[PDB]
Amino acid sequence: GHMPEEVHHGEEEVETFAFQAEIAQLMSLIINTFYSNKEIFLRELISNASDALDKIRYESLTDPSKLDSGKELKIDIIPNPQERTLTLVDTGIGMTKADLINNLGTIAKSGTKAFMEALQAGADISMIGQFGVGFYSAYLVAEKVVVITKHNDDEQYAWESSAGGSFTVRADHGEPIGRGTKVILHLKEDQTEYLEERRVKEVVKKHSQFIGYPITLYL
Ligand SMILES: CC(C)c1cc(C(=O)N2Cc3ccccc3C2)c(O)cc1CC#N
């Protein structure tokens, strides 16, 4: 046999970018401070999932073909005690590559900035969703967050950040999710209570009791 060397690939498959400084300041703030009620992170994710589900639901009024990718609108929650992850998957509208990079790395600048200003003036962490940036509350409990997303008009993409100032984005060739978003939280060691059935049930019942979509726990 011969030994080729592929000196160049079709396109750079992993890209790394810095957050806007304001986004990174918030993330650093969130991942390092004490908050007495970190369970709000699940409310924030379920809230973003509900909106993504509304978005595909309303386009399905006008185009029934937008669900050939999946007709059930639902949220699933999967704690995995042995890999210390908690996973939320929704069948909402998902995100193109352009919006993945933009929404999470860049145009969150306004909301994160107004929020840190509001914090200086007396706000607290639970109000983060009033500024459109509730997703970053995941770092209350996670040391590392992964986002897998699939929009009807694009391929599947993976996003990842450990809150070190940077994130990466790559074409994800993994479990095809069809459509929507999947979030994988790599939990801090002192936050393993969100891998128990009792507790996750408490948090959903306490905060997301009136979401208009089924939420299913896969213990
Ligand atoms: C990465 C975060 C921000 C996230 C994004 C989506 C998502 O694809 N959209 C698309 C869309 C369209 C309209 C209104 C809102 C949304 C949010 C999701 O379904 C779940 C999460 C998890 C959290 N928190």
From Swiss-Prot:
ATP binds at N48, D90, K109, F135. The chain holds residues 1 to 217 of 724 of the full protein. The record marks I128, G129 as: Cleaved under oxidative stress. This is Heat shock protein HSP 90-beta. Changing D90A: Impaired ATP-binding. Strong interaction with HIF1A, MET, KEAP1 and RHOBTB2. Loss of interaction with HSF1 and ERBB2. The TPR repeat-binding motif mediates interaction with TPR repeat-containing proteins. Residues 11-219 are annotated as: Interaction with NR3C1. Monomer. Homodimer. Forms a complex with CDK6 and CDC37. Interacts with UNC45A; binding to UNC45A involves 2 UNC45A monomers per HSP90AB1 dimer. Interacts with CHORDC1. Interacts with DNAJC7. Interacts with FKBP4. May interact with NWD1. Interacts with SGTA. Interacts with HSF1 in an ATP-dependent manner. Interacts with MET; the interaction suppresses MET kinase activity. Interacts with ERBB2 in an ATP-dependent manner; the interaction suppresses ERBB2 kinase activity. Interacts with HIF1A, KEAP1 and RHOBTB2. Interacts with STUB1 and SMAD3. Interacts with XPO1 and AHSA1. Interacts with BIRC2. (Microbial infection) Protein on the cell surface interacts with N.meningitidis serogroup B adhesin A (nadA). The keyword Transferase does not apply. Transmembrane segments: none annotated. GO terms for molecular function: ATP binding; ATP hydrolysis activity; ATP-dependent protein binding; ATP-dependent protein folding chaperone; cadherin binding; disordered domain specific binding; DNA polymerase binding; double-stranded RNA binding. Residues 4-216 are annotated as: Interaction with BIRC2. Belongs to the heat shock protein 90 family. Induction: By heat shock. GO terms for cellular component: aryl hydrocarbon receptor complex; axonal growth cone; cell surface; cytoplasm; cytosol; dendritic growth cone; dynein axonemal particle; extracellular exosome.
